[PDB]
Structure formats: C-alpha cells, structure tokens
Design a protein around this ligand. Structure first.
Ligand SMILES: O=C(O)c1cnc2c(C(=O)O)cccc2c1O
Length: 438
C-alpha cells in the first residue's frame, strides 16, 4: 500500500483484526532499522515501560524525551528518567496559558537512514492496549552522501515543513535533530505535514499552522468538484474544548470554513462529529476506565449543549474496533454517499481552539496555544482525483484508503449522551462489573 497508515494492535480482537496492525515493539524492532538514537515527542510518559519497548540490544542508545511538563510534573518526569543515563529531556516552551505539548512523534536515526513516525498514542501501556490509535510510518530515508548537494525535498515540502516545525521549539537538543534531517533524503514523502505550535501568527505566518495551514493546503492542492456543497465534513476526536455559546462563534464560522475549502475559487455542508457515547464507553473492552482518556468535563459540556446535536457514535466494524475506544483523531471529506473521500487527516489535534487556533485582532491574527502534529493525505499527491474508501480496513487496487471506522456515521439516539468524564454513571455496570464514580 502507498499510504502507510496503520492502527495499533488491540488486545482481545481476533487475529484477523491485528494482522496489519502495529505495536510499539514492532515499530522499534531491528527489522525496521539498526537504531543509533531516537527522539520521543509526547504528552504522557511511563519511562520504565517505554525503555522496555525498545529491543534489548537498543536500550542504551540515546533517547530524547520532548515534553511540555512544568513545575512538579517536570520534576516527576526527571525522576522517572534519572535511572537511565542515556535519556535526555527537552522541555517544550509553553508561553501561552492553557497550552500543552500534544504532538506524538518518533524520530528514529538508524545506521541505514532515518524514519519519522507520527502517531496518536501516549507512551504508556494503556494507550497501546485496547484503544483505537493511528500511526503514519515514513519510508526509510537514506542519508545524502557527504559532498553531494541535493535538497532531499519531496513534492509535498515535508522536509522543509518538518524542519520548520522543529525550529519553532527554539531548543538546542532539537537543533541536533534538525541537522540530522538536513543530512537525509526525504523526497519519497507523499503526505503533507500539518502542525500547530504556540503563538500569535499574522501576515506571512498566518498560513503556517493550525486550521489556516489546512485551508492553505486544500486551496493549493485539492480541486473543487461539482456539488461540493453536498460533500460532508467528518471530524472524529477524543476530547472537546470550549467552543462558545453557539456554532457561529468558532465551529461553523472559522473551523468548518477551513475544512470545507477546496481549490482556489471564491454553508449547508453537513458536519458529522464522531465522539463516544456513554454506552460506547460502558460496553468497551476497557469499560468505564476508557473514559479516563476522553476528558470532556461537565463544566465545559454544560456551556455548549448545542454541540451535542452534531455527535455520532463510535462504530468501527470495518476494523473490528467498535469496542476499542478511540484515541486517534481524524478529519476527512467524504462524498455524499461516503464511497470516496477528497482527503484524510490523522493528527493529535482534538476539537478545540487551543489545538487548531482561533482568530484574534479583527481576524488578522491566529492564536494557537498548543503543539500538535498530523499528516494529510491528498489524492493529488498520489496522482488521483479522489480516494476510494476501503470497504474492510484489513482486507485486500491498493489505491483505496483505509478509513478505520464505519461510514456513514450513526447519530446519537435520543437516550444517548456524550461521554463526560467527571460525573458518575451508576445505572448500569461496565464489561468488568464496575460503575464510574469520579
Ligand atoms: O493524548 C493527549 O494529548 C491527552 C491529553 N490530555 C489528557 C487528559 C487531560 O488533559 O487531563 C486526560 C486524559 C487523557 C489525555 C490525553 O490523552
């Protein structure tokens, strides 16, 4: 397949639903390359667990942990890593309030080249156990011969864009990785990088990040089709931020407007949002504890009940993952009969202004609070007009895109409620016999 989009392994599904899936031990295996050094960008780390996922022969190679923790949380992470002399830490600066470091990425330097992994899982056991998570695996990027002067750039500008993302940290440990990337040939890359970094961007920088970055890519590298107004937008996420008192504040005014862009020309486009119901969580493989990773608070939700009429259940029969709660986040543009898609994005970014950005200063400035990272699949980058949707995710022309959940999405029933993690659920027990009492 050309897309190299994978799901993580799920404990408890039949082997046919894990055949093409990846565990972190598979990604770090010597079959993928002979490791020299690695950088782990993430949010939450269990360092003891993380080191055990590297093959024994590679467990003393240098590891850089890139995180956003401050104060006591920072001290706790340093204490976790102190027993391992080969682990260094890089604290991503977070100068805007309520921002976090959500980017999930591995940089893997081998004897044989370089690989980039952009994914959705925290580096803790539970995120790789029974959740639906997404992985994009780069090709093995060869080193450019010393003395050869090549760009090593792809038609999607991935090399320059990844360097630009890392430069935004202003961090000495990442300048080392920038120099590594400069020395490798990334020309085979067929995805576009979509990142968020904290800041206030105007003018020439407005299109670099967040939902304006997506809009720019869709204007430049996708084509509008007739009846484009009939092609829905689908967003699928594991958390929701405060979006405002009604849909016109942000969701349907600037977010949806960026997502409905196609081509360079001058809305009743349906918007489907997929987010687990309480029943989805109760009957999941993990039971109610799965909701520990779906952190929608009652304080936020009670301020935006208008939002929940957009919500659709989690269903993933196509990949055997209906009971594996989603921590992947995806956004896409299906055709009116959901048989084709105009593009697909997998990312760390949840449905929030912090992650995607919000316009400020009379619409002249995009303010982003957090670090996020994802990759965009555009048909034009594969020589196509659209992607056909793969009917079964793990089944057998390889130019069909593996969408990991069912289409069309199913609207919440009248008795369904969105999972809200900080209220009790004591009416019916979960798959382990327990209630939820936060
Ligand atoms: O992967 C992430 O980016 C991420 C960020 N935050 C949380 C929280 C929280 O914000 O307290 C609670 C539970 C899960 C996550 C999580 O998975």
């Amino acid at each position: 397949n050309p897309f190299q989009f994978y799901l993580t392994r799920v404990s408890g599904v039949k082997p046919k639903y894990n055949s093409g899936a990846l565990h972190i031990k598979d990604i770090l295996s010597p079959l993928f390359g002979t490791l020299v050094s690695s950088a782990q960008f993430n949010y939450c780390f269990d360092v003891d667990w993380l080191v055990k996922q590297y093959p024994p022969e590679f467990r003393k190679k240098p590891i850089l942990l890139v995180h956003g923790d401050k104060r006591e949380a920072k001290a706790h992470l340093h204490a976790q890593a102190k027993p391992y002399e080969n682990i260094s830490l890089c604290q991503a600066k977070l100068d805007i309030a309520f921002g976090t470091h959500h980017t999930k990425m591995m940089l893997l330097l081998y004897e044989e080249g370089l690989r980039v992994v952009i994914h959705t899982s925290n580096l803790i056991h539970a995120d790789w156990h029974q959740k639906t998570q997404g992985i994009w695996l780069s090709p093995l990027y060869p080193r450019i011969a010393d003395g050869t002067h090549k760009s090593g750039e792809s038609p999607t500008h991935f090399k320059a864009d990844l360097i630009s993302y890392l430069m935004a940290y202003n961090a000495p440990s990442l300048k080392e990785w920038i120099d590594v990337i400069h020395k490798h040939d990334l020309s085979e890359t067929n995805v576009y990088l979509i990142g968020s970094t904290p800041g206030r961007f105007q003018g020439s920088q407005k299109d670099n990040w967040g939902h304006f970055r997506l809009k720019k890519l869709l204007k430049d590298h996708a084509s509008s089709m007739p009846n484009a107004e009939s092609w829905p937008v689908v967003g699928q996420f594991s958390s929701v931020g405060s979006l405002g008192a009604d849909e016109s504040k942000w969701l349907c005014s600037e977010f949806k407007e960026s997502m409905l862009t196609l081509g360079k020309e001058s809305s009743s486009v349906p918007l489907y949002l997929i987010y687990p119901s309480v029943e989805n969580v109760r009957t999941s493989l993990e039971g109610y504890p799965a909701g520990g990773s779906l952190p929608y608070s009652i304080q936020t939700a009670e301020k935006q009940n208008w939002l929940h009429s957009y919500f659709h259940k989690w269903s993933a029969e196509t990949s055997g993952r209906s009971n594996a709660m989603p921590h992947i986040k995806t956004y896409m543009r299906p055709s009116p009969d959901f048989s084709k898609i105009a593009w697909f994005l997998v990312t760390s970014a949840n449905l929030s202004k912090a992650a995607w950005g919000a316009l400020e200063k009379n619409g002249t400035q995009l303010m982003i609070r957090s670090y996020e990272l994802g990759v965009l699949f555009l048909p034009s980058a594969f020589g196509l007009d659209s992607f056909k949707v793969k009917q079964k995710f793990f089944a057998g022309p390889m130019a069909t895109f593996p969408v990991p959940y069912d289409l069309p999405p199913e609207l919440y029933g009248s008795k369904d409620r969105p999972w809200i993690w900080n209220i009790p659920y004591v009416k019916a027990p979960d798959t382990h016999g327990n209630m939820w009492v936060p």
